[PDB]
Curated annotation (Swiss-Prot), chain A:
Involved in the biogenesis of the 60S ribosomal subunit. Belongs to the TRAFAC class OBG-HflX-like GTPase superfamily. OBG GTPase family. NOG subfamily. The lineage of its organism: Eukaryota, Fungi, Dikarya, Ascomycota, Pezizomycotina. Coiled coil: none annotated. It is found in: Nucleus, Nucleolus. The gene is NOG1. This is Nucleolar GTP-binding protein 1.
Amino acid sequence: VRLLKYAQSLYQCKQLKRAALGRMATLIKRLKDPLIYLDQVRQHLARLPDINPTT
Amino acid sequence: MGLRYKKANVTHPTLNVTVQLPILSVKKNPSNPLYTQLGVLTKGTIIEVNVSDLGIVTASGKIAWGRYAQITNNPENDGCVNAVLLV
Amino acid sequence: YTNQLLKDICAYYGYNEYLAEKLLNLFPPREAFAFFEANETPRPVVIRTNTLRTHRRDLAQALINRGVTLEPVGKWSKVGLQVFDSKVPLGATPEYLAGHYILQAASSFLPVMALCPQENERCLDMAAAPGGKTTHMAALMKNTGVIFANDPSKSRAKGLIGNIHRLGVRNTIVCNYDAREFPRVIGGFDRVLLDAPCSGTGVICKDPSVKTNRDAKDFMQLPHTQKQLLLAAIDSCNHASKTGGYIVYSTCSVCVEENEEVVNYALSRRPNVKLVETGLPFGKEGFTSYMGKTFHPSLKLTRRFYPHLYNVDGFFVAKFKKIG
Amino acid sequence: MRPLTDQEMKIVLDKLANYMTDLKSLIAPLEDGDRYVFRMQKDRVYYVKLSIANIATCVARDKLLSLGTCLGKMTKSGKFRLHITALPILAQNARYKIWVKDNGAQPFLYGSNIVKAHVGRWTEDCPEHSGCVVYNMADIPLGFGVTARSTAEARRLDPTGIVCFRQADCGEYLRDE
RNA sequence: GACCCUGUUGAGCUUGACUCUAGUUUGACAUUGUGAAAAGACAUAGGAGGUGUAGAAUAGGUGGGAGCUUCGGCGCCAGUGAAAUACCACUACUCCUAUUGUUUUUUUACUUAUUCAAUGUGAAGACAUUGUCAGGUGGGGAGUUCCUUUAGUCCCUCGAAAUUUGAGGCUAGAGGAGAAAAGUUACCACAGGGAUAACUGGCUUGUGGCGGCCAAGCGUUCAUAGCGACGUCGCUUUUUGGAUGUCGGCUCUUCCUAUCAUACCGAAGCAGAAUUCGGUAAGCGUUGGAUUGUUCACCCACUAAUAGGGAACGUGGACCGUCGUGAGACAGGUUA
């Protein structure tokens, strides 16, 4: 945001936006495996029996 | 305020390792001596970088702390500042 | 085992093997471990008041008003204070801008405190790279007398002169000379101050390079250079004066090759020197003999300062009086 | 390694009398007989004692850098200048003194010209372009300069107006570090 | 406008020859004495030494030596220590006492040194004082027209260092009208000159950069003069969950879809319900409050839902100057 605020040209904004979106893309690319693990735990915790310990 | 960068991504031509290291100072910007004096970081600009973390051993079995590194990207195009170390 | 401890310390802390051997010789394993933890631990920052311009309670009140947390540095130093936190930068505050104080270390306190400059006296400082020592001599003598300041380098020289004019010493002549050349060129000073360049093993928090950037070659050349430095200082000093004049040697090195050995050499070479009690309250006794090398038993009065014992930079002092 | 010459010390005393009053007191004999004498090295002038000059002349011209207190340097056109290094003597023998507040002194230490809201109290009978010395509230010498106008015009002028043309201040010292 | 140049001005950096010397100057010496008071260091005679560390221990140190052994105390062994201990021999220093004295220095008093008054004898008083050299400086005066960068000799000298280095000498690679002021800068203010009349118009979007590995092909002659996509590896990037300046505000028409909802289906541990993603789809409709300079974010209230945009971004000062140049001002004008 600061870089774009001090941007001076259309190509400047071009490459700045491309670079930022690339950073987020690479971050998710590394986050590839936690998403799979959390999807699996979500599926089971959904298909988990629900008891009442107090009753 | 924001446009300065404190550390640079230095790639070592030998040992094939890239590490983030602090910037010591700016020595020569070939585009403009005025940019050199101010400290402008353009493409191909040699700066002094602390390489204590790398731990390269020099002659007499001695270690080095500060070495030349050529900024080799266009930081205005891509904010991240990247240099190749000179060894 | 000794070798196992050496390897473990070198691996875990990054010290060179040879310097680690010297430090292990210097301190027992408990004291050694405390010393290494201390010297990787950052030192506190102190502020020295400009007695010529203002006084301690007024400066403290001003910095409290501006939000700086202060504490007096022991009973020993009246002119000093210690900084905990400061909302306003210390550089930009009006007191520092006007010259009410300076930033420094307690090791910068100790040597000029050992010295006792008086009014209308002739003084020398062949190493005043920050300029705090010259400024504090000026503050002690109340801008009465003459100060000569000698430097090797234009850069720290201009830093020196900036500090001097900011603190308003008004009676110092600043020069770029050789410290060895100074006595023959002028000589005849009532008091002389030597902050000899050393290995810097005392303060690796300020100089992390010394953790490794010290080889045996440096450990050999540096003591020879400071030996010639003390030769120059003792040549400069005056034996007889209306006000007693003394030589002060201060260094920031902890290794024995730098400490007590060169002063033993100077004492052996020139009988005119005696050593007197340097007058410093907290310190450690000088070693009578370290590595098969007998030193004059009078070195008992010599003081040492360690980061682990006291929250001060590793520092070394010596005070001498000239007969003829 | 020279003393000043005729026109050189003429311009020097011209500036020094535009800014001070008792240049007799500056160049007057002392009790011991030693005198404060103008020195100039590398086209830069210094104020030293005669004994200091005598004991310093033993040094080679190139190796010696500073002597006494630097007063100023002469430009290529020959115009003489007095600096913040020469500030203390100027404050000691000031003719007109102008005192500023803290909120105005901070821009003054930065390098900004004096504004009317900055000054605390005024000197009287000040000529329009006469030199003056700028102090803070604590009578600490901050700088020197030529006033834009006289005291009465400053009184009747807008608070936002420029008061003194800010020549030199404490900035030079930390500039070099 | 950016931008280039010119002159002035500042900010600088550097040069401003060589040899003596005035101005100088640092240290010593002598002049310079007599006493008294002291102190220090060298003469000696003696007493006692000795821890940074660990080792049992407060380890001068060196040479022999494995128990003289009075006793096996302890040698030996053994740790632990740079150094190991018994012994008998050696010599260094100190901490001192004393005097068996020599010197040195400070202070005091006095005149005998020195210097003044008087001037053809008096006084200050060992303070000043003068002269002697060993230095350094020197743009001032006079006169004429080597140093800088690098490596070796590791040779000689001076040092240091328990034996190897440091600083000079030596050698050989490259450099070079004078005090009046100068050279020069992608720099500053000022005044001026020069140059562009101004921007985009098959431009815009969703996937970063640097380096390496791999890589079909092409290439100077062949995947190696080399160019070279997709991927992967290293850095950003990891072991415990506020940004926003002038603006807006409302309504209305029309259009696009890059679709919030309605309709339709494809996929999902989609039991049901409630959902998520994907696409066909513009007929339909698409509300507030807080907060703020003000918007969005976030926050909460309704509601099927509160989606994004376009409509030539749809309709209702600068000089003439005058007074200042280390910085500015002007109820001055010409006025567009």
